[PDB]
Amino acid sequence: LIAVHREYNEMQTIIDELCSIQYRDVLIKLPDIVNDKQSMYSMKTACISLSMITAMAPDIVRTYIDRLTLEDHSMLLIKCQELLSKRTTLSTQRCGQLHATDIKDELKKIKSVLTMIDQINSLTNEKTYFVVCDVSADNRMATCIYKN
């Protein structure tokens, strides 16, 4: 998604911040991504699903952000307020806030939003090959009960 945005040295300024990650006190990084079009198909379907989440998102949900900001208050919540304050590139406010028993349509829309989220997760999610049960004290050999 970012290397579509064709730049010079901004690709580097993104990559050197991005690639070195830390999980369980371990630094790993993956170099030399020539950014072929094979990732572009796997990214096009994420783009499709974000468009559909937008169009089929109900009236309860975008309201739920502002309503919980008015009801509760937290620093953690603020972080999400900071994202919604940092980007306001949609600004299309809805009209009605009555919710006058549209509840089957609401169920249908929320099922659709969850299913599009499942599609993006089915992109980003890789298949579990093994399930650990018993680990040696060396953390060198471990037993699993599952083979693809």
Added chain:
Amino acid sequence: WYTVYNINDPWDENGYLVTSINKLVYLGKLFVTLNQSWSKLEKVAMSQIVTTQNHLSGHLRKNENFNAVYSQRVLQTPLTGQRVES
């Protein structure tokens, strides 16, 4: 000369449902009000015409000229509100 008011569209407590129900109540009341007012005025006009026919006829009854008795018969023709235009 009657005018249907309107339901203010931006504000409403519930939506399509309660504005339809309020419209149905207001329109049923307007319908029965206009029909009762019309029937009231038509019954008034017919009562006054049938009242004045008798006071006209009793005063025209006495004389015996042909123009007199022809005026008596023309003005003693019976009337309904559906016969009044002719």
